[PDB]
Design a protein around this ligand. Sequence first.
Ligand code: XYR
Ligand code: CL
Ligand code: CL
Ligand code: CL
Ligand code: ZN
Ligand code: ZN
Ligand code: ZN
Ligand code: ZN
Ligand code: ZN
Ligand code: ZN
Length: 305
Amino acid sequence: VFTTVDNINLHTQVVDMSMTYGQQFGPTYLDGADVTKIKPHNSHEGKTFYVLPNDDTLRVEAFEYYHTTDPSFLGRYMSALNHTKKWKYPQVNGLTSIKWADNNCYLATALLTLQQIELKFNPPALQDAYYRARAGEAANFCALILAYCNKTVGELGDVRETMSYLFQHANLDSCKRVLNVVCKTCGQQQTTLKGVEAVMYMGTLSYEQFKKGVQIPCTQATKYLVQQESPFVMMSAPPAQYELKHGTFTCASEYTGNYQCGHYKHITSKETLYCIDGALLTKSSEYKGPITDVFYKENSYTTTI
Ligand SMILES: Cc1ccc(OCCN(C)C)cc1C(=O)N[C@H](C)c1cc(-c2cnn(C)c2)cc(-c2cnn(C(F)F)c2)c1
Ligand SMILES: [Cl-]
Ligand SMILES: [Cl-]
Ligand SMILES: [Cl-]
Ligand SMILES: [Zn+2]
Ligand SMILES: [Zn+2]
Ligand SMILES: [Zn+2]
Ligand SMILES: [Zn+2]
Ligand SMILES: [Zn+2]
Ligand SMILES: [Zn+2]
């Protein structure tokens, strides 16, 4: 048979029918199911298998595809895939969603959001699954998202936290946010953020109000945006009522329920406002509801006065 870790480079070996896979290879998975305890059925010859890296060439191949040396990563990924490959991934309004199952509401909103913003992932396994997800096959993408966030199937997830984990594995080096806070006592201090901190802010959902001025305490001073060089901006705030106006944003995440046990729903702005709840779709002209994250498009911004 064949054993690999990246599925790009394969290594051919043979198995004895009377010895279980673990003694010959180590922890071995097939199609997301652990075949370590299973003895070789001999029904499949030449089939590709996933093994935890043992050699040094395997360890190096594993990092070049995943960008991690954690030995637990492969196991956490294969156990997530075992669930995600039986989920349904319908296509709603030209976007790939997820039929609700095992509290994946936060995963679906993230998947729909990632298909609407410009992003490039540094780990090749993430980028390759990102492409496959856009086409309509996102089982490996959702499993990798769980493994990189160290989350499990059924576990309760927050969209803002999931996006920030994903942003740290993406090339946001070109992004830049220049801030300036002014206090009548301390004066004026100019700070310059870069990377994940340049595309995310917690406090308001309104990109305008962030450009206008938000009130943060000083050692209350006012914080306003001065320059933004990012393909997008994520505006996060604790869940509250908000009126989404058609054409003033890209997409938003709605959270309705109690802390940690509420349900996420996704709103996107097209020719009208659309609401995606897994496999369901809802259309309206304007939206008002509990909103916690709003995504805006951007290329370059420079403050005036
Ligand atoms: C679903 C889930 C899954 C996991 C999860 O983990 C959080 C813990 N992490 C550190 C691991 C959180 C959540 C979760 O409910 N998220 C939503 C958007 C939410 C809801 C509420 C809320 C308040 N009252 N009610 C009825 C709801 C408040 C906040 C909040 C406030 N401040 N902030 C920020 F300042 F931090 C965040 C966030
Ligand atoms: Cl890395
Ligand atoms: Cl990385
Ligand atoms: Cl926008
Ligand atoms: Zn090789
Ligand atoms: Zn990396
Ligand atoms: Zn399941
Ligand atoms: Zn399942
Ligand atoms: Zn849910
Ligand atoms: Zn001060």
